[PDB]
Nucleic acid binder design. Sequence first.
RNA 1: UAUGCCAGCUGGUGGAUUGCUCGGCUCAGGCGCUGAUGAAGGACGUGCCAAGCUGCGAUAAGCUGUGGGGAGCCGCACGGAGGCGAAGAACCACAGAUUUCCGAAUGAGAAUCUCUAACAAUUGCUUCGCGCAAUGAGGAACCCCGAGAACUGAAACAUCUCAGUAUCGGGAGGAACAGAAAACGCAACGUGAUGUCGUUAGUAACCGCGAGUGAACGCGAUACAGCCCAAACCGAAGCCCUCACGGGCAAUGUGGUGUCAGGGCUACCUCUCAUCAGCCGACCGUCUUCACGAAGUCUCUUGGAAUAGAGCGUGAUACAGGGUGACAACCCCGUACUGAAGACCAGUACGCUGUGCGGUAGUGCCAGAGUAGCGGGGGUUGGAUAUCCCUCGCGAAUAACGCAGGCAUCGACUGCGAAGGCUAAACACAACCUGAGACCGAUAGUGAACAAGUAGUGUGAACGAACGCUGCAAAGUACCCUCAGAAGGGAGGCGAAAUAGAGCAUGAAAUCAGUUGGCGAUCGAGCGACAGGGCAUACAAGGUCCCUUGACGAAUGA
RNA 2: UGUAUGGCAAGUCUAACCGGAGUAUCCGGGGAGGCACAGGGAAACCGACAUGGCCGCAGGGCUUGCCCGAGGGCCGCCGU
Lengths: 246, 119, 145, 115
Amino acid sequence: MQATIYDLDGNTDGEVDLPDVFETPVRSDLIGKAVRAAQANRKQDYGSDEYAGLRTPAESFGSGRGQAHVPKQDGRARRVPQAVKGRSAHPPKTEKDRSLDLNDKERQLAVRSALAATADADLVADRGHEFDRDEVPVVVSDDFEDLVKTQEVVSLLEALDVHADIDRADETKIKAGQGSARGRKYRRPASILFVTSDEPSTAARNLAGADVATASEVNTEDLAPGGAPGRLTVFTESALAEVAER
Amino acid sequence: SKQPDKQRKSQRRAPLHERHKQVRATLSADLREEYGQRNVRVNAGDTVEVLRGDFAGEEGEVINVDLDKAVIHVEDVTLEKTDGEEVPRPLDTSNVRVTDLDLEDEKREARLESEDDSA
Amino acid sequence: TSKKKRQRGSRTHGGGSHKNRRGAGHRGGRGDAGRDKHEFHNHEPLGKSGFKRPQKVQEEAATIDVREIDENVTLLAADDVAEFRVDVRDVVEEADDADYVKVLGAGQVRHELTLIADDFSEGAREKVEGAGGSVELTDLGEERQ
Amino acid sequence: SKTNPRLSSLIADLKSAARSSGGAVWGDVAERLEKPRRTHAEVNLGRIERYAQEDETVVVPGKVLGSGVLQKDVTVAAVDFSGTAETKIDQVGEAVSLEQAIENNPEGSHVRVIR
RNA sequence: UAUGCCAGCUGGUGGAUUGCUCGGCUCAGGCGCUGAUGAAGGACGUGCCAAGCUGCGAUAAGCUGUGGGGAGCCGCACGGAGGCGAAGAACCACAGAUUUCCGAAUGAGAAUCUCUAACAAUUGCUUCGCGCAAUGAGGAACCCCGAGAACUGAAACAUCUCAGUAUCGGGAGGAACAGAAAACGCAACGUGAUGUCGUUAGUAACCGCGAGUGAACGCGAUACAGCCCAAACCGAAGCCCUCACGGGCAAUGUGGUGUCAGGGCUACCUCUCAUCAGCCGACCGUCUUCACGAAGUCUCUUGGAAUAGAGCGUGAUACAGGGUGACAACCCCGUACUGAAGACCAGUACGCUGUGCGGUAGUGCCAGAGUAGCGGGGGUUGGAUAUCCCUCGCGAAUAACGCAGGCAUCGACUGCGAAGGCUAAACACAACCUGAGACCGAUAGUGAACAAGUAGUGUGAACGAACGCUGCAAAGUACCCUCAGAAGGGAGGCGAAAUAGAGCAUGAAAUCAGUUGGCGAUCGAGCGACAGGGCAUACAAGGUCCCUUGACGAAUGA
RNA sequence: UGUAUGGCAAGUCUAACCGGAGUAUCCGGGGAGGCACAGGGAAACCGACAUGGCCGCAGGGCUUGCCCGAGGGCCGCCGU
Ligand SMILES: [Cl-]
Ligand SMILES: [Cl-]
Ligand SMILES: [Cl-]
Ligand SMILES: [Mg+2]
Ligand SMILES: [Mg+2]
Ligand SMILES: [Mg+2]
Ligand SMILES: [Mg+2]
Ligand SMILES: [Mg+2]
Ligand SMILES: [Mg+2]
Ligand SMILES: [Mg+2]
Ligand SMILES: [Mg+2]
Ligand SMILES: [Mg+2]
Ligand SMILES: [Mg+2]
Ligand SMILES: [Mg+2]
Ligand SMILES: [Mg+2]
Ligand SMILES: [Mg+2]
Ligand SMILES: [Mg+2]
Ligand code: NA
Ligand code: NA
Ligand code: NA
Ligand code: NA
Ligand code: NA
Ligand code: NA
Ligand code: NA
Ligand code: NA
Ligand code: NA
Ligand code: NA
Ligand code: NA
Ligand code: NA
Ligand code: NA
Ligand code: NA
Ligand code: NA
Ligand code: NA
Ligand code: NA
Ligand code: NA
Ligand code: NA
Ligand code: NA
Ligand code: NA
């Protein structure tokens, strides 16, 4: 198929062939598996102290005093799991393998599939993204990489009738729960993914919900955050071309 | 760090000289333009305007600046005790704006006027 | 919902009487305990059998059946096409860490082939010569006399 | 509890064809696909070559693999083919998806099931 | 109707629950020795008032210098009094001063004191004098060298296993240890110091051949580095102390040469850039700290308070996180970008000074002994005839020799020189610094969010808790009455709220006081389920229900 | 050792580790090695049906009982 290139003013400036990978049949089950693995693989090992509750010489008196056979120290129960201050019977363990493997082929297929979901306006709309456009992904000239100011990227996005998505992501959510006590108070919608070629867009990165990436290493997660296919993306002329052989 | 416990901790345990930054207030439009700074460390000679509490809108001279509790006393911003005595209502500098500066100190003035440093 | 997930409330978690799941007695001893007594069933009988020759006196032959060679003659375009002529050593994988390459005769030979290897089975020869081909024994192959 | 949405759609399409049209093979192929993956067909070319006949579409209720040689000019229809299988088959005949088979022959006539 | 039963209401009691996090737990990066120049630890002191903690040491919450920092300050700790600071204090960094007693504890003795100059004790050097030096002890674990169980498993148990584990003795470092082949033995026309990681592989090997046990070569990686003696041949050409003088060491050999690319010697060729000694001496990176750092505190409404809703506007290489009277990119700290310093890498790499590599021919000059090896007895190992070690006895050759290649002997072949020594880097731990989290969230998580190894128990070794939350701001309740009264109560005052009033957010259940509805002093006990009646009931969140008659009308059926 | 789902398929998967980067995630590289592709025999050593016959389910075909009949079943034959 064909993809309409846009200059830094938002006007049409020719067009190139949309590479074959964007025709890869959308596979949400494979995309979800790739994201699930990437998410698991960055989780940190944890577990309670191996000796927690065991630092005591507490002994049970056995039969005789009308008491349950429970280890006691200074007239206070200890060690056993049913005892307050006792050990945790089956606690989290550091030794546990919290990683998920994934065949390279299966993962690479998910990358291609997530890439292809990006070329479907309906899917992108179902994912939640706000925009007034028919063609997708949004292809732009390589000059986008030379932009420096965030506001300039804004103007271009408004000129591309795609800025409404950033308006959507411009709302943080103060999460329910104790994640707040561990530094996870906020969360926000995922908006536009900017795929460049030489370096991630420093100018577009701070945009609400935006993620920047490069064609050589863009992954399933940035292409389909949370395992959901069809992220509103904007490739760079060269990025579009590079992504073709992934 | 990004961790909340560590952030609050470093703010509550900061050594005396690091507490000066906890008693900073935004400068008025005129003062910002004049010295090229958005805010300043409120001093006990400055005049300030309350922008947020029950005293919002009132102006007065800063009478005291406590580094430990990171709070300031502004003239007439008070509370009436039971016995009738009038005691100051502690204010957080964040709810205040500096409209006039006490520049009797050569060092403070120099710090304000210099462009490579902020007071 | 998994089996495990449905155990809360069952008391015994599928173990039958609560007197069951205790120590090793419930297994008749730890590991292979009783493999000759109460649990001899389905264990290989006790005893010694045979001998082993030292590992460095053992030879490992890299084999391949004529069927594999023959099924890919056209596909092996990067290998001699005479009046096909293929050196088996250049075909078999794992042919380096092997003491020698041997051609076995499983399958058919639908082409006239000229095979070069260190050894061949009587059946591999009959098949290669039967389809109007030849079998060339390598210099290493000169160990049969 | 199939997980692949495409395999799931194929199965539903196979049923629709067996019901609407006269096809009995499609519904038969649908039932085998609904069964566990371990039971699905895994056929090499040597088997297709041995039991196929020209102008009779070979139907594999699974996947076609590339071992062996195919010389017959047959049309093979499967859920999927390995890269090599599809290459060998197209040299002497034609590799086709079950999705195309259902469209070109909804009545499922002149077909041979091979597993 | 008393005594009383059930449910609720008001108020207690209690501290669950929800929300909150100054603490934990775990992972990761960095970094890493201290002590006779008396450490670590402890004791006792030290403040205006000072009990605890912290700090400090008779100069006692501190003294001095430099740099930073800045108008405030006098630790935790918000009192009273008083004081310090523009003579630039507080505070932070680096460096210095002071630094009681006990403590390895060292003049001697002693439960932290005492008695009449002290390296006690053991050593090296030695001016043979404690003159110059060393050792001792500590440290979270890691590391190296020794000693070495049992419960347990084998469904008993003895070999085996647990296990060279626990525990004990000795000792080093920032890392240890190992290490330049008498190797390997995919047997080769092959590899080429050593650790470590992945694999080889639960393979080979062991084993009441039961249960169990269990490598290596090689390969892919990480990091890479290779050298010095003894002797031959020389023979005082040498070394240490001292400013010097002078002294000490050394023919029982200091020093030169030399170290399997064997060397020495004799005769030659050529040459050095090898090696060794020494000088200089980083970049980058990484860790931590610091400087600078954009943009609203506009309108209306609600509110005690706007960070809320509606409206208008702004920055962004900064929309991580935190604070601020409620949900904050633009109010404050920060955050992106840029820059600076210290530490580590490292006295390393690079560069340089000096030395001089190597080759031919001749020469039986040299080349590590209770050794190699054998036997007796044990331990250990996967090591089986073929692991490594100990002990007692025996015991060789000399490169023209010797050892190894998984039984012994002889020959061949291939590899390799033991009985002297050193050696960077890659790897272990986590005290210390910093960062992180699908970890816990106050009966959890450390024993320990609090006075925590605290209070307290035991002669002692040792054992060992519980206790988090007023409020936006103390505005922490003036005055009056009552009272034995700084109690308490009444009235009153503050605040959005006192049912936020001090172990004070919320405030469950068990349960208690008062009280409401129902039952109740002639009556029977799993306390109820299902039916059906009495009596009782503010709203809300349910709106149905009763009787005449009529329609429909299964089985059944006058 | 099974099972369900998914990728690839006569193959399949990388381990340690290396480079990149948005720096524990992630992208690229790495096939050392493992299992599978031949078995039998203590060992020496030797080394197999890409189909020869008959039944026949599903399915297909036909002129509607008759053919073709993967899989399956019964035999042959082959390696040791
Ligand atoms: Cl064998
Ligand atoms: Cl097959
Ligand atoms: Cl080798
Ligand atoms: Mg606990
Ligand atoms: Mg909750
Ligand atoms: Mg300034
Ligand atoms: Mg290989
Ligand atoms: Mg003494
Ligand atoms: Mg036993
Ligand atoms: Mg037994
Ligand atoms: Mg053992
Ligand atoms: Mg070996
Ligand atoms: Mg020398
Ligand atoms: Mg043993
Ligand atoms: Mg606790
Ligand atoms: Mg006792
Ligand atoms: Mg309360
Ligand atoms: Na304890
Ligand atoms: Na009891
Ligand atoms: Na783990
Ligand atoms: Na069971
Ligand atoms: Na049980
Ligand atoms: Na057993
Ligand atoms: Na028996
Ligand atoms: Na350190
Ligand atoms: Na005190
Ligand atoms: Na001191
Ligand atoms: Na000494
Ligand atoms: Na002396
Ligand atoms: Na037993
Ligand atoms: Na016993
Ligand atoms: Na044994
Ligand atoms: Na090899
Ligand atoms: Na504020
Ligand atoms: Na011996
Ligand atoms: Na050897
Ligand atoms: Na508590
Ligand atoms: Na391989």
